[PDB]
Structure 1
């Protein structure tokens, strides 16, 4: 066929019941994730092609960057709770990988302040049990698919995108193939 298991995607031996429809994992420490977000705009191009009624979820992971990696997973929970993902994703990626000015939890916090989230409001969210369960959710989703690498995208808890099996000569063409593959799997 045009789409073949083991070619643009793999099937999970171990399907995950009740999983989010489109589930993406990343790390602010992850160099392809930086490409995916700032250069390729994967999440965005997938969404433009997803059918109606299909919600998109993105989670941070702990297994890169040690202590700071876990802080970032908690910060991403804060970002999700406050609905400010679209204001911190770029400065977090750049603070970690470009300027390397994010070295501590305080430096992460500065990014939110500079993005206009009030200190009071960030610290309250950071310390909230609504953020602790959102951290729990991120960890459980990753654990459910035995996640050992990022970037990663899973559809309907049973298919995993396989970007190595796509051409990267043209960045534009790679992105649409990726997005079209998610749509295909979505409709499966």
Structure 2
């Protein structure tokens, strides 16, 4: 066939019940994730090829970057809770990977403050039970697929994208192959 199990995607031996329709995992410590975000714009390109009626979910993971990795998962919970993902994603990536100015939870906080989120608003969210459960939700989604690598995308808790089976000579062509594959899996 054109799309074959084990080439553009793999099928989960242990499908996941009730999972989000399009689910992306990443880490601000993750180099292909930085690329996916700032160079490729994968999420944006997938979204514009996705069906009417399909929401996209993106979660952070703990297993890169030690203590700071976990801090970033909680910060991403704060971002989701406040709905400020599009304001902090780029400065967090640059802070961790480009300028390397994020070394502590306080440096993460600085990114939000600089992005216009009030300190008291940030601190209230950080310490909140709603954010605790959003951290738990992120951890549980990753646990459900026994996630060992990022970036990763899952469709309907059944299919995992396999970007290693895609051309990388051209970045544009890679992105569209990725997006078209997601659209295919979603219609499946």
Task: Tell me, yes or no, whether TM beats 0.5.
Answer: yes
Whole-angstrom CA distance in 2 between matches of 1:48 and 1:78: 26
Whole-angstrom CA distance in 1 between matches of 2:4 and 2:54: 23
The secondary structure found in structure 2 opposite 1:97 is helix
* Aligned twin of 1:141: 141
Whole-angstrom CA distance in 2 between matches of 1:179 and 1:75: 28
CA drift at 1:113: 0.2
CA drift at 1:76: 0.1
Whole-angstrom CA distance in 1 between matches of 2:112 and 2:47: 25
CA drift at 1:3: 0.3
Whole-angstrom CA distance in 2 between matches of 1:112 and 1:61: 19
TM (norm. structure 1) is: 1.00
CA drift at 1:154: 0.1
1:117-144 per-position Cα deviation (integer Å, ceiling 9, x unaligned):
0000000000000000000000000000
CA drift at 1:41: 0.3
TM (norm. structure 2) is: 1.00
What number of residue pairs does the alignment pair up?
A: 188
1:95-120 per-position Cα deviation (integer Å, ceiling 9, x unaligned):
00000000000000000000000000
The secondary structure found in structure 2 opposite 1:175 is helix
Whole-angstrom CA distance in 2 between matches of 1:98 and 1:151: 18
Whole-angstrom CA distance in 2 between matches of 1:106 and 1:35: 25
CA drift at 1:180: 0.3
Unaligned runs of 5+ in 1: none
Whole-angstrom CA distance in 2 between matches of 1:66 and 1:2: 40
Whole-angstrom CA distance in 2 between matches of 1:23 and 1:186: 11
The secondary structure found in structure 1 opposite 2:6 is coil
CA drift at 1:177: 0.3
CA drift at 1:88: 0.2
CA drift at 1:83: 0.2
1:7-38 per-position Cα deviation (integer Å, ceiling 9, x unaligned):
00000000000000000000000000000000
CA drift at 1:187: 0.1
Whole-angstrom CA distance in 2 between matches of 1:138 and 1:114: 25
Shift >6 Å, 4+ stretches:
none
